[PDB]
Design an enzyme around this catalytic site. Structure first.
Site, short mmCIF file in Angstrom:
data_model
loop_
_atom_site.label_atom_id
_atom_site.label_comp_id
_atom_site.label_asym_id
_atom_site.label_seq_id
_atom_site.Cartn_x
_atom_site.Cartn_y
_atom_site.Cartn_z
N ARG A 106 24.29 1.13 -5.20
CA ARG A 106 23.99 2.30 -4.35
C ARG A 106 24.07 2.07 -2.83
NH1 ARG A 106 18.87 3.33 -8.05
NH2 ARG A 106 19.70 4.64 -9.71
N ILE B 62 19.36 2.44 -15.57
CA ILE B 62 19.45 1.59 -16.77
C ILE B 62 18.71 2.26 -17.91
CG2 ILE B 62 18.68 -0.60 -17.79
CD1 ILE B 62 19.33 -1.90 -15.07
N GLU C 2 20.69 -0.86 -7.56
CA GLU C 2 20.37 -0.56 -6.16
C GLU C 2 21.43 -1.17 -5.21
OE1 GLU C 2 18.36 1.74 -5.70
OE2 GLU C 2 16.44 1.56 -6.73
N1 LIG Z 1 15.24 4.49 -16.10
C1 LIG Z 1 15.38 4.01 -14.83
N2 LIG Z 1 14.63 4.40 -13.71
C2 LIG Z 1 14.88 3.83 -12.47
C3 LIG Z 1 15.97 2.83 -12.45
N3 LIG Z 1 16.12 2.36 -11.22
C4 LIG Z 1 15.23 2.95 -10.45
N4 LIG Z 1 14.48 3.82 -11.16
C5 LIG Z 1 13.54 4.46 -10.21
O1 LIG Z 1 12.21 4.94 -10.45
C6 LIG Z 1 11.97 5.79 -9.31
C7 LIG Z 1 11.55 7.16 -9.81
O2 LIG Z 1 12.55 7.62 -10.72
P1 LIG Z 1 12.29 8.98 -11.54
O3 LIG Z 1 11.28 8.57 -12.59
O4 LIG Z 1 11.71 9.91 -10.50
O5 LIG Z 1 13.61 9.42 -12.08
C8 LIG Z 1 13.28 5.95 -8.53
O6 LIG Z 1 13.44 5.00 -7.47
C9 LIG Z 1 14.30 5.63 -9.59
O7 LIG Z 1 15.63 5.38 -9.07
C10 LIG Z 1 16.68 2.50 -13.68
O8 LIG Z 1 17.60 1.68 -13.72
N5 LIG Z 1 16.33 3.09 -14.77
#
Ligand SMILES: Nc1nc2c(ncn2[C@@H]2O[C@H](COP(=O)(O)O)[C@@H](O)[C@H]2O)c(=O)[nH]1
Ligand SMILES: *[C@@H]1O[C@H](CO)[C@@H](O)[C@H](O)[C@H]1NC(C)=O
EC number: 3.2.2.22
Length: 246
Positions: A163, A71, A160
């Protein structure tokens, strides 16, 4: 665009929403019969818009990066809101340009930062269709602390669930009563990138993971996923994050 109405929502209509969400994400290839999200998409085509309606019929529109199901931000009446992170800033060049004002949230969208902003870990925030209705309502009227919790609900009940079939089913079980996510739910969320990578590596390795992925099962016990015959791969995961983005 994909749409979901909380008014009259039930497990079937939610299931149709999550199917629509998955179906909107473009892919050219499947890996072990699972759609492989694209490495990149340039321009406005990178973003999917989800229209969500609370029980009273008020709406937000949520922008989703179609390469990673992240998102980026959302529109509520005439105000846009984007996470404080570069991918969201880029998105803001392409979506909700018609907003009268743009607010940058005071956190990025990762789970760690959202939990800090919310004052609570996901483990303690009930999810379900009532919680999603509440989250939509919260996001209509800017409060950054309340919004963090709402966004943890929104991400789990859309991205999620898209997924992982198991997460979709968990939300369906919570159509009329919220409940904190199962431990297995949290484990899957936390493992999506790892699983996506290992499933891709398994092509070229006879379906065997280069590195096992450790999960928690719904009962509570830790399991190792070592190859593509695991139920997680055959009958749960629905979308793969491209290794180019890992
Ligand atoms: N911007 C953003 N980060 C997310 C979202 N959903 C989960 N995250 C989660 O934050 C965690 C770390 O993400 P990362 O910061 O490493 O890309 C992961 O589980 C990632 O999927 C989302 O909808 N938006
Ligand atoms: C493949 O995964 C299945 C299911 O967990 C397991 O029984 C089997 O031992 C695994 N085989 C290898 C070679 O990892």
């Amino acid at each position: 665009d994909v749409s979901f109405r909380l008014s009259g929502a039930d497990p079937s209509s939610y299931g149709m929403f999550i199917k629509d969400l998955r179906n909107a994400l473009p892919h050219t290839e499947k890996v072990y019969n699972i759609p492989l999200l694209l490495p990149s998409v340039s321009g406005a085509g990178r973003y999917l818009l989800m229209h969500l309606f609370n029980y009273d019929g008020n709406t937000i529109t949520v922008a989703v990066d179609v390469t990673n199901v992240y998102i980026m931000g959302y529109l509520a009446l005439t105000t846009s809101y984007f996470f404080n992170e570069p991918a969201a800033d880029l998105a803001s060049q392409y979506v909700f340009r018609s907003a009268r004002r743009k607010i940058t949230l005071p956190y990025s969208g990762n789970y760690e930062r959202l939990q800090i902003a919310a004052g609570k870990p996901r483990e303690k925030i009930p999810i379900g269709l009532p919680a999603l209705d509440t989250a939509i309502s919260t996001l209509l009227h800017y409060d950054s602390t309340a919004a963090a919790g709402a966004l943890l609900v929104l991400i789990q009940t859309t991205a999620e669930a898209a997924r992982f079939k198991y997460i979709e089913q968990q939300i369906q079980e919570r159509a009329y009563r919220d409940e904190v996510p199962s431990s297995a739910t949290i484990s899957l969320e936390n493992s999506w990138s790892g699983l996506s990578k290992q499933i891709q590596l398994a092509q070229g390795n006879n379906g065997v993971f280069r590195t096992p992925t450790v999960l928690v099962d719904s009962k509570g016990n830790r399991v190792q996923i070592t190859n593509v015959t695991s139920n997680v791969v055959t009958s749960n995961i629905q979308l793969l994050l491209n290794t180019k983005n890992i």
